[PDB]
DNA sequence: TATTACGCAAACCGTGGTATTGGACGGCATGGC
DNA sequence: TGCCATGCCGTCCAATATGCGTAA
């Protein structure tokens, strides 16, 4: 079986004659009878004569998917349809990353996403291999073939129990915070949030008081919700109305958002994300 | 062209063009030239596969309809009933669904059957698009236009190594299992069996000690046969007499799992209607 | 078998080389090497290989970290006994109760018992029963536990369940919805990989109510699920602790039913209990 | 904080008088009292009150005496745990399988290895021959099991045993070929094969001199057996598949010169872990 | 009106030792209660 | 008279350096 025999058969069916369709497609009569006579051999039955209803219901359905299939394969390359395998790590989940995907899904409504938790490292392997598309965290070291895109900057906020709201007012700076018993995060991750918080202190001269380092951002505020600790978080987390906790920005003391992706052989839906995240960067 | 699709599907299988030609007894220049012609006729980079995997999917669909148009037309001319395309997910494939298929093929002798493995969700996509007439599994969520009919219900059986066989006996309750290392299944087929087993445990106030979930039933029973872990199967598998594995009927009130099938109620082809009449005719049996 | 042979080995396995480790330890390379060849003698197994660790190296790593962090706990365990303080209650947790539940119990406990402190450690519903029976953890919190022969399971309270949809979907369910109201909501659950946990009970509670539910996705934790919900790509189900927090662009709707509660629970080894856990267990039972 | 003070302070407490401790320790007394100064200086707390009649443990004395024995078990017991890891006595053998050996062959090999290494475990995941090698090289999988493995750099094939082939046909059709049969008897039978495998089966007819009549083709073994016991197909299966008493299926031993499929065992050549290093010790030895 | 009988053009395949100096830690002797 | 601390010194450890149109 081949394609010409199916369009012929449909044309011969709609025209009711092996010559009325021969003009409906602009070719002489011998080939009309040359291919349907050969069509009834690629099948075995006698469709028409000087089972035909059974093979017609299929032939119009074989070409229908053929045209529709071409419109999928092309639109797939245009990145209009496709699942984005997003990987993440840490603080930008609470507010940052969700707004970036929902804004990207407004940009490309047919696309879907799949979240896969991964450390800043397992992203690099996951990107250099092709398991994931983008990896979200804050502090990424360079890697010979991975490009970073710094999107924006977040403020850092002190978290404290509501009982001690007035003890630090609305907002206070970094030096006001030498005796605060900061309990940071995360335990996992070789140089992540806490390590850079410690860094912004030494660059500011104050050696920080740190009592414990817990697993999550939500584990440091868990201790704060019980008054058993005080922590410091990005503006993403402080945007959430956390019960029993009070927040205060810290006043050259920002941390960034950065997605990482492989620079070679980029899938289309990934490049449509890169398009939306770069236009969303400078704005 | 039809010669083009084949080549492409043989090339996505192969990964390189040289091996694919070996599978077609052709050379590399022919398939390369035709893939160039096809990439140009479609308008998408298909190269080492590219973002035109959707074309691979639709081309598999097209060749499926080509074959199932040939065979369909033949059997329709013969006055036969045709070829009932049945999908299956999970454990029914082991014993239950084969008996149902035999009971249908003997009653409708002019009819044949074809099996392709799909998930509970892949089965609804197949029932819609016209890929399959009926799908078979255990726990189906309702879906508009699709109808579910459970043929019968099966008992559950603990499956433990023949050494740890005399410990449980001929039958055992769920409460006997509060400290048993259960290796369940199937891993990754959406909510299916293992989730129902956990639900049956959680329904009796027992949060179960579960150590593993492996590929399908055969992997769990292979870790059982290997004296590594015990599992829970339904009676379809337990009635296959697996070597070195002993089964004890898990007795209880809500300890049973159904065999259900799904089909489209909109446009029911005649073979599907005959098979549904048989299935309902075997609802009480 | 010597403490400096432990501090050297740990910094080696962490930095990944016998030079940045000596840099991280303020020593030279010869003594770092000389103490490892002495370490490989008292134990008898090759730990390091030209740097990665042998399987002997990793199994010995978790032993050496248990030793050092034990001495660090004792360093403060003694100074608090001098002042007669109640001390450190090492508590573990797994799952949804960390968002509101467990913070409030520790809040009230640290009010009634003032001289005590707490350490939070994220373990698994069976990684706890290991720590309990070994003493590394006093009480571990989570939802659904299996009975273990040495551990006493105790329930604390019930929490409700809330369907989590985007703020736009809020009118579809209003304030209250039942389980059957969700028969066709593509749900994104959690936690992924923490043995049988939350998602497996939600699958049960539907299955218990005769609803084989639609499950779309399972992600790492609750935070990752509500993220896909506040982005519109998901609709989730969270307990009361997660919903008691006001989350942006997310509308929570209570699930109404006669068997739709999930519990708060802690576990403790009932054999040789330290006195601070006793002052703690006498406070959690009073919560009922 | 060093180990010598831990053995002393316990002996000082167990003796009740530091003088008696030095004898049980086979040392002179001035070390005892001198070590306890540095011990209480590194800790920064008072453990012992001294009189002319002996000592008595302070509040820190008891509180640290428990921490002391706990540190000293692990120090001694960490050596025995590390020797087991290096010895391969402990470890999870992460096996990956593909196809028909899972029905009987691989279970018995895992059983024979576990019988010979009882303090070990097995994680059984399912992978394609390409996922195995793409995983063995990376390291996510210890050993891969399947029928026919392609020679690849970095790995090592081990053809351990051979399995005869068996005609699978329905119980009704069972008297048509006998308890055994040669390859040529199967000229007319319509064979529903499955992969890989089905490529090698046709090879076995073609290598004995037959162009077989292939009817259908699935890609699951239980899918071929399903059609067979349903009265819709016949197939050719390994002995592991025929070893299972299949409910309505009958099996007939295919006999002939070199008509058998092998059981192959694939693993990475370099840098093999202990639990694998013993497992291959059990693979090659059991080849007899 | 549908097959047939032709020919020509077109399609398409063959780190680990070595040496020294500083400290640790024990063992005898004395002082303090 | 035990029992605990304090010096002094010697030895050991450790760490830096073919497929159509045309014709029949």
Q: Are D204 and B76 in contact (CB under 8 A)?
A: no
| Distance in angstroms (rounded) separating the CA atoms of residues B23 and B36 | 19
DSSP A206: P
Q: Are C241 and C99 in contact (CB under 8 A)?
A: yes
| Distance in angstroms (rounded) separating the CA atoms of residues D72 and D78 | 10
Minimum-distance CB partner of C63 among D62, D74, D91 = D74
Residue A85 has φ and ψ, to the nearest 5°, of -85, 90
Residues of D in contact with C70 (CB under 8 A): 67, 70-71, 74
| Closest to C218 measured CA to CA, from C249, C246, C244, C186 | C186
B169-to-B162, B164, B166, B232, B253 alpha-carbon distances in Å: 11, 10, 5, 15, 19
Query: What six digits make up the tokens of A170?
Result: 């609305």
Residues in chain C whose beta carbon is closer than 8 A to a beta carbon of chain B? 144-147, 149, 183-184, 195-196, 200-201, 203-204, 207-208, 211-215
Q: Are A114 and A86 in contact (CB under 8 A)?
A: yes
Nucleotides of E under 7 A from a protein CB: 1-5, 12-19, 25-29, 32-33
Residues of A in contact with C247 (CB under 8 A): 240
Please report where in the chains the tokens 């929902």 appear, as a residue: A102
| Distance in angstroms (rounded) separating the CA atoms of residues D78 and C61 | 9
| Distance in angstroms (rounded) separating the CA atoms of residues C122 and C131 | 11
Query: What six digits make up the tokens of B270?
Result: 């005649």
| Distance in angstroms (rounded) separating the CA atoms of residues A198 and A210 | 9
Burial class (CB in 10 A: 0-12, 13-18, 19+), D131: middle
Query: What six digits make up the tokens of D90?
Result: 């402990």
**Adjacent-strand bridge partners of C122:** C93
CB atoms within 10 A of CB C242: 28
Please report where in the chains the tokens 């309505």 appear, as a residue: D248
Q: Are B146 and B124 in contact (CB under 8 A)?
A: yes
Minimum-distance CB partner of D227 among B115, B223, B225 = B115
DSSP A207: P
| Closest to B210 measured CA to CA, from B223, B194, B225 | B194
For chain C, the C-alpha Rg in angstroms (whole number) is: 24
Closest C-chain CA to B184: C196
DSSP A230: B
| Distance in angstroms (rounded) separating the CA atoms of residues C169 and C154 | 38
Q: Is A87 helix (H, G, I), strand (E, B) or coil?
A: strand
**Adjacent-strand bridge partners of D163:** D261
Inter-helix orientation angle B217-225/D105-116, to 10°? 40
| Closest to D147 measured CA to CA, from D100, D217, D110, D111 | D100
Burial class (CB in 10 A: 0-12, 13-18, 19+), A129: exposed
Residue B213 has φ and ψ, to the nearest 5°, of -135, 120
Spell out where chain B has E strands.
82-88, 111-117, 134-137, 146-161, 171-173, 182-184, 210-213, 231-234, 245-251, 256-264
Minimum-distance CB partner of C248 among A88, A214, A240 = A240
DSSP H helical segments within chain C, as ranges?
3-15, 20-25, 29-43, 55-82, 101-112, 127-134, 170-173, 198-208, 222-229, 240-243, 275-284
Q: Is the peptide bond before C191 cis (omega within 30 degrees of 0)?
A: yes
| Distance between C172 CA and the closest CA of chain D, angstroms | 42
| Distance in angstroms (rounded) separating the CA atoms of residues D49 and D58 | 7
| Closest to C175 measured CA to CA, from C254, C258, C260, C256 | C254
Burial class (CB in 10 A: 0-12, 13-18, 19+), C21: buried
CB atoms within 10 A of CB B261: 25
Are A69 and B59 an interchain contact pair (Cβ–Cβ within 8 Å)? Answer: yes
Q: Is D50 helix (H, G, I), strand (E, B) or coil?
A: coil
Please report where in the chains the tokens 């003694």 appear, as a residue: C78
| Distance between B243 CA and the closest CA of chain D, angstroms | 7
A142-to-A149, A260, A261, C88, C216 alpha-carbon distances in Å: 11, 10, 11, 41, 35
B274-to-B85, B127, B141 alpha-carbon distances in Å: 13, 16, 24
Q: Are C208 and C134 in contact (CB under 8 A)?
A: no
CB atoms within 10 A of CB C160: 18
Query: What six digits make up the tokens of C200?
Result: 């497996």
| Closest to D148 measured CA to CA, from D167, D124, D129 | D129
Burial class (CB in 10 A: 0-12, 13-18, 19+), D104: buried
Cα end-to-end distance, chain A, whole Å: 57
Burial class (CB in 10 A: 0-12, 13-18, 19+), B254: exposed
Residue D129 has φ and ψ, to the nearest 5°, of -55, -30
Spell out where C129-183 has E strands.
139-142, 151-159, 161-166, 176-178
Distance of CA B40 to the CA centre of its chain: 37
Residues of C in contact with D1 (CB under 8 A): 3, 71, 75
Residues closing a segment before a gap in chain C (C–N exceeding 2.5 Å): 50
Q: What share of chain B is helix, strand, coil (3-state, %, to 5)?
A: 45, 25, 35
Residues of C in contact with A82 (CB under 8 A): none
Residue A168 has φ and ψ, to the nearest 5°, of -125, 10
Q: In the Cβ-directed half-sphere of D137, how many Cα atoms lie within 13 Å?
A: 8
| Closest to A260 measured CA to CA, from A93, A132, A113 | A132
A162-to-A84, A171, A248, C14, C251 alpha-carbon distances in Å: 40, 14, 12, 38, 25
Three-state DSSP string of D249-286? EEEEEEECCCCEEEEEEEEECCCCCHHHHHHHHHHHHC
Q: Are A156 and A197 in contact (CB under 8 A)?
A: yes
List the determination method: X-ray
| Distance in angstroms (rounded) separating the CA atoms of residues A166 and A179 | 16
Residues in chain B whose beta carbon is closer than 8 A to a beta carbon of chain C? 139-143, 178-179, 190-191, 195-196, 198-199, 202-203, 206-210
| Distance in angstroms (rounded) separating the CA atoms of residues A62 and B58 | 10
Q: Is B166 helix (H, G, I), strand (E, B) or coil?
A: coil
A169-to-A172, A183, A234, A248, A251 alpha-carbon distances in Å: 7, 20, 18, 8, 13
Torsion of CA B234, B239, B242, B244, to 10 degrees: 90
Query: What six digits make up the tokens of B179?
Result: 């400290």
Query: A203-227 burial string, b = 16+ CB within 10 Å, else e?
Result: ebeeebebbbbbbbbbbbbbbbbbb
Give the closest residue to E28 (Cα–C1′). D28
| Distance between B256 CA and the closest CA of chain C, angstroms | 13
Q: Is the peptide bond before B186 cis (omega within 30 degrees of 0)?
A: yes
Are D229 and B93 an interchain contact pair (Cβ–Cβ within 8 Å)? Answer: no
| Distance in angstroms (rounded) separating the CA atoms of residues B267 and B172 | 46
| Distance between C151 CA and the closest CA of chain A, angstroms | 25
Residues of B in contact with C184 (CB under 8 A): 141-143
Strands C151-159 vs A182-184: parallel, antiparallel or unpaired? unpaired
Q: In the Cβ-directed half-sphere of B6, how many Cα atoms lie within 13 Å?
A: 14
Strands A134-137 vs A254-262: parallel, antiparallel or unpaired? antiparallel
Instruction: Give the angle subtended at the CA of C83 by the CAs of C78 and C88, to the nearest 5°.
Output: 55
Per-residue DSSP letters for D180-219? EEEGGGGSS--EEE---HHHHHHHHHHHHT----EEEE-S
| Closest to A188 measured CA to CA, from A141, A125, A137 | A137
Nucleotides of F under 7 A from a protein CB: 2-7, 14-17, 19-23
Are C146 and B191 an interchain contact pair (Cβ–Cβ within 8 Å)? Answer: no
Chains that touch C (3 or more CB pairs under 8 A): A, B, D
Chains that touch A (3 or more CB pairs under 8 A): B, C
Q: Is A272 helix (H, G, I), strand (E, B) or coil?
A: helix
Q: Is D154 helix (H, G, I), strand (E, B) or coil?
A: coil
Q: How far is the CA of A42 from the C1' of E8 (A)?
A: 28
Q: Are D96 and D140 in contact (CB under 8 A)?
A: no
Burial class (CB in 10 A: 0-12, 13-18, 19+), D53: exposed
| Distance in angstroms (rounded) separating the CA atoms of residues A237 and A159 | 10
Q: Are D102 and B219 in contact (CB under 8 A)?
A: yes
Spell out where chain A has E strands.
83-88, 112-117, 134-137, 146-161, 182-184, 210-213, 231-234, 245-249, 254-262
Residues of B in contact with C183 (CB under 8 A): 141-142
Q: Is the peptide bond before A186 cis (omega within 30 degrees of 0)?
A: yes
| Distance in angstroms (rounded) separating the CA atoms of residues C16 and C53 | 9
Identify the H or E element spanning C218: strand C215-218
Q: Is A165 helix (H, G, I), strand (E, B) or coil?
A: coil
Cβ-7 Å neighbors of strand E: A 17-19, 29-30, 32-34, 37, 50; B 1, 3, 25-27, 29-30, 33-34, 37; C 17-19, 29-30, 33, 36-37, 51; D 2, 4, 26-31, 34-35, 38, 52
DSSP D55: -
| Distance in angstroms (rounded) separating the CA atoms of residues C204 and D137 | 40
Classify the C-alpha dihedral C244-C250-C256-C259 as positive or negative.
negative
Q: How far is the CA of A2 from the C1' of E1 (A)?
A: 26
Q: Are D273 and D91 in contact (CB under 8 A)?
A: yes
Burial class (CB in 10 A: 0-12, 13-18, 19+), D72: middle
Are A222 and C247 an interchain contact pair (Cβ–Cβ within 8 Å)? Answer: no
Give the closest residue to F20 (Cα–C1′). A31
Distance of CA C238 to the CA centre of its chain: 17
Q: How far is the CA of D30 from the C1' of F16 (A)?
A: 32
| Distance between C120 CA and the closest CA of chain A, angstroms | 7
Q: Is D237 helix (H, G, I), strand (E, B) or coil?
A: strand
Burial class (CB in 10 A: 0-12, 13-18, 19+), A138: buried
Q: Is A185 helix (H, G, I), strand (E, B) or coil?
A: coil
| Closest to A151 measured CA to CA, from A253, A236, A260, A277 | A277
Q: Is D227 helix (H, G, I), strand (E, B) or coil?
A: helix
Torsion of CA C1, C2, C7, C9, to 10 degrees: -30
| Distance in angstroms (rounded) separating the CA atoms of residues B256 and C155 | 30
For chain B, the C-alpha Rg in angstroms (whole number) is: 23
Cβ neighbors of D179 (< 8 A, separation 6 or more) are D252, D253
DSSP A145: T
Residues closing a segment before a gap in chain D (C–N exceeding 2.5 Å): 195
Residues of C in contact with D275 (CB under 8 A): 55
Distance of CA D272 to the CA centre of its chain: 13
| Distance between A49 CA and the closest CA of chain B, angstroms | 14
Q: Is B10 helix (H, G, I), strand (E, B) or coil?
A: helix
| Distance in angstroms (rounded) separating the CA atoms of residues A156 and A237 | 10
Q: Is the peptide bond before D29 cis (omega within 30 degrees of 0)?
A: no
Query: What six digits make up the tokens of D109?
Result: 């090999």
Q: How far is the CA of C30 from the C1' of F16 (A)?
A: 9
For chain D, the C-alpha Rg in angstroms (whole number) is: 33
Q: In the Cβ-directed half-sphere of C60, how many Cα atoms lie within 13 Å?
A: 31
| Distance in angstroms (rounded) separating the CA atoms of residues C79 and C62 | 27
Are C201 and B202 an interchain contact pair (Cβ–Cβ within 8 Å)? Answer: yes
Residues of B in contact with D227 (CB under 8 A): 98, 113, 115
CB atoms within 10 A of CB C154: 17
| Distance in angstroms (rounded) separating the CA atoms of residues C111 and A228 | 10
Cβ-Cβ contacts under 8 Å between B and D: the total is 107
Inter-helix orientation angle D59-87/D274-285, to 10°? 30
**Where do the structural domains in chain A lie, given as residue ranges?**
7-78, 79-152+257-282, 153-256
| Distance in angstroms (rounded) separating the CA atoms of residues D150 and D130 | 9
| Distance in angstroms (rounded) separating the CA atoms of residues D167 and D173 | 11
CB atoms within 10 A of CB B130: 16
């Amino acid at each position: 079986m081949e394609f010409r025999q199916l369009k012929y058969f449909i044309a011969v069916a709609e025209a009711g004659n092996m010559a009325a369709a021969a003009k409906r497609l602009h070719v002489s009569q011998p080939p009309i009878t040359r291919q349907m006579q050969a069509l009834e051999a690629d099948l075995g039955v006698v469709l028409l004569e000087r089972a035909g209803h059974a093979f017609l219901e299929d032939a119009r359905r074989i070409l229908e998917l053929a045209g529709r299939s071409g419109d999928r394969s092309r639109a797939a390359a245009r990145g209009d349809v496709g699942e984005l395998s997003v990987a993440y790590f840490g603080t930008p989940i609470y507010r940052s990353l969700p707004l970036l995907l929902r804004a990207f899904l407004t940009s490309t409504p047919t696309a879907t996403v799949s979240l896969t938790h991964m450390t800043k490292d397992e992203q690099v392997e996951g990107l250099l291999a092709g398991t994931i598309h983008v990896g979200f965290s804050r502090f990424f070291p360079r890697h010979p073939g991975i490009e970073i895109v710094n999107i924006a900057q977040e403020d850092l906020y002190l978290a404290v129990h509501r009982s001690q709201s007035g003890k630090f007012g609305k907002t206070c700076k970094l030096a006001d915070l030498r005796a605060v018993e900061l309990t940071l995060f995360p335990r996992g991750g070789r140089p992540s949030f806490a390590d850079e918080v410690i860094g912004l202190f030494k660059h500011a001269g104050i050696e920080p008081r740190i009592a414990r380092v817990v697993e999550d951002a939500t584990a440091a505020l868990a201790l704060t919700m019980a008054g058993a600790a005080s922590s410091i978080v990005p503006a993403s987390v402080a945007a959430i109305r956390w019960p029993d906790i009070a927040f205060a920005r810290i006043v050259r003391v920002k941390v960034p958002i950065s997605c990482i992706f492989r620079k070679e052989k980029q899938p289309p839906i990934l490049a449509r994300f890169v398009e939306h995240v770069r236009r969303s960067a400078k704005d």
